[PDB]
Paper text:
OGFOD1 catalyzes trans-3 prolyl hydroxylation at Pro62 of the small ribosomal subunit protein uS12 (RPS23) and is conserved from yeasts to humans. OGFOD1 in Homo sapiens, Sud1 in Drosophila melanogaster, and Tpa1p in Saccharomyces cerevisiae were found to catalyze prolyl 3-hydroxylation of the highly conserved Pro62 and Pro64 of uS12 (RPS23) in humans and yeast, respectively (Ban et al., 2014; Katz et al., 2014; Loenarz et al., 2014; Singleton et al., 2014). We describe crystal structures of the human uS12 prolyl 3-hydroxylase (OGFOD1) and its homolog from Saccharomyces cerevisiae (Tpa1p): OGFOD1 in complex with the broad-spectrum 2OG oxygenase inhibitors; N-oxalylglycine (NOG) and pyridine-2,4-dicarboxylate (2,4-PDCA) to 2.1 and 2.6 Å resolution, respectively; and Tpa1p in complex with NOG, 2,4-PDCA, and 1-chloro-4-hydroxyisoquinoline-3-carbonylglycine (a more selective prolyl hydroxylase inhibitor) to 2.8, 1.9, and 1.9 Å resolution, respectively. Prior to its assignment as a uS12 P3H, crystal structures of Tpa1p revealed that it contains tandem DSBH domains, only one of which, the N-terminal domain, was predicted to harbor the catalytic machinery (Kim et al., 2009; Henri et al., 2010).
OGFOD1 crystallized in both trigonal (OGFOD1:Mn(II):NOG) and orthorhombic (OGFOD1:Mn(II):2,4-PDCA) crystal systems with either one or four molecules per asymmetric unit (ASU), respectively. Following optimization of hits from high-throughput crystallization trials, diffraction quality crystals for full-length H. sapiens OGFOD1 (542 amino acids [aa], 63 kDa) and S. cerevisiae Tpa1p (644 aa, 74 kDa) in complex with Mn(II) and inhibitors were obtained (catalytically inactive Mn(II) was used as an Fe(II) surrogate). The OGFOD1:2,4-PDCA structure reveals slight variations in the inhibitor hydrogen bonding patterns between the four chains in the ASU, suggesting flexibility within the 2OG binding pocket. OGFOD1 and Tpa1p bind 2,4-PDCA slightly differently. In the Tpa1p:Mn(II):2,4-PDCA structure the 2,4-PDCA C-4 carboxylate is positioned to form a hydrogen bond to the side chain hydroxyl of Ser240, yet surprisingly is not positioned to form a salt bridge to the side chains of Arg238 or Tyr173 (corresponding to Arg230/Tyr169OGFOD1), respectively; in part this appears to be due to the unusual conformation of Arg238. These observations provide further evidence of flexibility within the 2OG binding pocket of the uS12 hydroxylases, a feature that might be exploited in selective inhibitor design. In all of the OGFOD1 and Tpa1p structures, the inhibitors ligate the metal in a bidentate manner. The structure of OGFOD1 consists of nine α helices, six 310 helices, and 24 β strands that fold into two distinct DSBH domains. The “catalytic” metal binding N-terminal domain (NTD, 24–238) and the C-terminal domain (CTD, 270–542) are connected by a linker region (239–269) and pack tightly against each other via their “minor” β sheets (as defined below).
Numbering used by the authors: 24 to 371, 430 to 542
The structure:
Amino acid sequence: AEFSDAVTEETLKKQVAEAWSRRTPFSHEVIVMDMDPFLHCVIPNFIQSQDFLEGLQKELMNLDFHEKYNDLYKFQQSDDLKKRREPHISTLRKILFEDFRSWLSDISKIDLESTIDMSCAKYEFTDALLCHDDELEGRRIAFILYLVPPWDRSMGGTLDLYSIDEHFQPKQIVKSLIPSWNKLVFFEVSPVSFHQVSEVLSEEKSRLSISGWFHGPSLTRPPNYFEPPIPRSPHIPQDHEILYDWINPTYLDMDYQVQIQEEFEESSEILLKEFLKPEKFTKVCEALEHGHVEWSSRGPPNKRFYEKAEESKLPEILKECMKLFRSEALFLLLSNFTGLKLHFLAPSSSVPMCQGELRHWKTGHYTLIHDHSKAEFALDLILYCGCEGWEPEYGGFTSYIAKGEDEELLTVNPESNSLALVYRDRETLKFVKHINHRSLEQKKTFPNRTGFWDFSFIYYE
Ligand SMILES: O=C(O)c1ccnc(C(=O)O)c1
Ligand SMILES: [Mn+2]
């Protein structure tokens, strides 16, 4: 087999070359090329032999697939295609990396290498690949061939293209391409080529694709942009006594704190159930639902996506709960839980500090590791609210990982009125995993509720 004789036709080929050269859009029945938000082209009916595609799909489905998972994605990848000796796959490598490569090199005027870089992916219900730019030394042009069943927008799995802002960071989705059988999409890898594969919503269908890169000369990325640091502050001096009013009395007994600390110094992590008094916890949840909390979406999409409350406008109960977590008394309680010096009367410049946010998590939200995700000695605190009947399979758990390793260290799951404490070192990073569409099952038991909320606080010695 071969690829579309149409696009190899010399006049059309020269029209394509002209549009790439001049960076101008070009529309044709057999090819469509757009320059915004960045250069991307679509060739439908990429391989004319329908017999070949059937045999190819048959070979791929008969491969073994392996779960792939981290902050950025969740899907399945096949045995390496570079190592396969089945005829249809072997033929595809040649078509792509010899025939089609030269055609691309000709229209793009890039000395593309013959280096084979291709793989087969399978996205099913809740699989997704979040905002990223494909950046990796050598990659110049990304391509995707789709071998999907009949597909539409409501099934998800669309390839979305992000616009960009004044700081070269993704802003919003401005193009959304729907996969279809024998459709080839390719685009230029650049500092601005931010894109994602939206969550697959089809509970029955499987989004099968072949994707990879043509390699070429390395360029220079501009220096990466650094967010301003989040302000930190020391404890709020106790005026009125606050622990007694808020915390389960179990945790204010000395005998129980030594137990807690013995366990904490062993694991550097602990979970404290029923942490707030029930009456307070119920009033906090009630205020989060009915109290006119003002939420705002946080970005950018290659770092985070979630809602954060404007603390100054909160209901008094939620203000008071934020105060609890900044309070001198709590700083000392956390010292007795952990063995860390977060108050000057704890057992033995520097001044302990903290930062805090009240967050709302729903379907679609996440955080990602990014080049500037910075590691520090620090104690994390999370109190979850409004997540009754929440399952880890829904996403939304916090995960800790050793830097530059797939060795996962710990996972904290949303649990109503559970206080999680985690001490990190400078070689530890964290993320909140994409909340997927299984989380809609939450409404079967609590219909007047969308996702969950948490108080997230970080303390430093
Ligand atoms: O398989 C895809 O649709 C796809 C699209 C964009 N990027 C990737 C990737 O693996 O980076 C995969
Ligand atoms: Mn990609």
